[PDB]
Ligand binder design. Structure first.
Ligand code: NA
Ligand code: NA
Ligand SMILES: [Zn+2]
Ligand SMILES: [Zn+2]
Ligand SMILES: [Zn+2]
Ligand SMILES: [Zn+2]
Lengths: 65, 65
């Protein structure tokens, strides 16, 4: 793709944005699933990953650069 | 911003793309710095993080979703 720019931009914004608050950017990696889908403010409120449903056993704070 | 879409798209592509191979997408988080800047193919060739310069002491495989 090969797809409209604003459509490509929307897809990247979406994958970089928190899946629970739809506001702040992702910054927490779940262990063991490895999803990067929530921000640091939202992570403590979760027992399980929003995407798959693995019970979060650890977390790593990450920075996109 | 408030900036041209193709410019916004370029910035997001760049932050999602490996900083060493400029090809595959980022998928490794460095420990302790927490940078997500390289792919899984490129990570083993590094002793230090490309962005800051922390000596990588561990890694977590992450998936953007
Ligand atoms: Na998990
Ligand atoms: Na590091
Ligand atoms: Zn959030
Ligand atoms: Zn998950
Ligand atoms: Zn790479
Ligand atoms: Zn670093």
């Amino acid at each position: 793709s090969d797809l409209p720019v604003e459509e490509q931009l929307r897809r990247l914004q979406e994958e970089r944005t928190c899946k629970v608050c739809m506001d702040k950017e992702v910054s927490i990696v779940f262990i063991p699933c490895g999803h990067l889908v929530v921000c640091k403010d939202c992570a403590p409120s979760l027992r399980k990953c929003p995407i798959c449903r693995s019970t979060i056993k650890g977390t790593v704070r990450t920075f996109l650069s």
